[PDB]
Amino acid sequence: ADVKLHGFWASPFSYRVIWALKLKGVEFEYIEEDLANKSELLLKYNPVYKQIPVFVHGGKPIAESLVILEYIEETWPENPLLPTDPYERAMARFWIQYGATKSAAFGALFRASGEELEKAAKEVVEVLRVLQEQGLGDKKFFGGDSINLVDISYGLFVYWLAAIEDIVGVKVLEPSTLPRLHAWAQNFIEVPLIKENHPDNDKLLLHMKGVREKM
Amino acid sequence: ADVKLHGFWASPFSYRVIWALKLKGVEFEYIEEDLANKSELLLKYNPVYKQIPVFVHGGKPIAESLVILEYIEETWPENPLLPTDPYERAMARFWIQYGATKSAAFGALFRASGEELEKAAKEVVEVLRVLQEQGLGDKKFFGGDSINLVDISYGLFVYWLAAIEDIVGVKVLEPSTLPRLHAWAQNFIEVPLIKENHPDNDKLLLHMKGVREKM
């Protein structure tokens, strides 16, 4: 059954799926979607959200990156991206859900006014501290010695932190404040799979700087 | 390994876990938590959210009802509450996630002012229409001929609809507007497992009416 991925060049959600497929060694056709003029296939495949990514396997579509990632893990179980033990799997799902819930704080910091900025940055630092202390601990990656679906889901945090630093100017992931999480972020971007698969940084900063003009 | 459940008498989230355990035939000790004075075990077991439910198995805790439900399904796989096929499992997770995301609209309607009420009720009806058309379809339950984790996760919607109708007075799940979803709601409350396990309706309406005094 052939695999298609409808994505967007600057989307971290589309990149989550690219990472999981490339890790599994699953060949796929990538389809770049124009978000200003959504394709007939995108609207047919994702009527509920009308968003990318849309993963298609054997002509059958799946929307929502977290749902797609679990389908990929179940369909191509070799090179596992989740643990086999139910309790460890529940801890992985717990941290993936925590990230999804707290993702709103990153967008809030990105659009915060000159005054709102201090409180927004404070809330992001506390989210990162809990993630570091209770989620990562002393492990190299959320997945232990190699990346797993938890690391993949936290690519979105790295994407936001780098955009807030380069465009806004506030630093929320500092080595002296969060040494373990900062070491994790550096180690994650150095994983060859990640290094080989990410938006062009200059093009991404420019696009995101322009998107921030919503104020 | 013994099973404990830290819950709250009026919590639909605690009831999701009770339903799944009773369906699986798993014996458990139930611990009623005083939300005004959280127990030492609750704060130790759920430091991230400090919320019930907290499920404990072999002394190991799990927080977040959706995470707990998947652990129960994986640990006691007999009497399955999720399909075995990855694509059907992905559709179940998709609809469970849709419910979690849209749950905020129900709280919004519950606390809406006399003016906000019309727009809040409109947004809830559209959430229910998409759930009915694209999620339930012509099936008796989200799980087909019997309830599954999707039906269990949508107990929360039934809890809200009955509270909005009895206290506020607005009807958002009408038989002539949503015939299939209304038939589903009636069929769900008639399932003996559900009928035997829910908060005392009079006590629940009174508690919720008092909680609505946050305006």
Residue numbers in the entry:
A (entry chain A), B (entry chain A): 2 to 216
What does the paper say about this structure?
The crystal structures of PtGSTU19 and 20 were solved in their apo form (U19 APO and U20 APO ) and in complex with GSH (U19 GSH and U20 GSH ). The H-site of PtGSTU19 has distinct properties. Nearly two-thirds of the helix α6 of U19APO (residues Val159 to Gly170) were refined in two conformations. The first conformation corresponds to the one found in U20APO/GSH/GS-PAP with Trp161 buried (ASA of 10 Å2) and a deep H-site. In the second conformation, Trp161 is more exposed to the solvent (ASA of 44 Å2), which reduces the depth of the pocket. In addition, the side chain of Tyr160 points in the direction of the assumed catalytic serine residue (Ser12). To our knowledge, this is the first time that this helix is observed in two conformations in the apo form and in one conformation in the GSH-bound form. Two-thirds of the α6 helix is flexible in PtGSTU19 while only one conformation is observed in PtGSTU20. The disorder of this α6 helix could explain why it was not possible to obtain crystallographic structures of PtGSTU19 in complex with flavonoids. In any case, this region (Glu34 to Lys51) is one of the regions with the highest B factors in PtGSTU19APO.
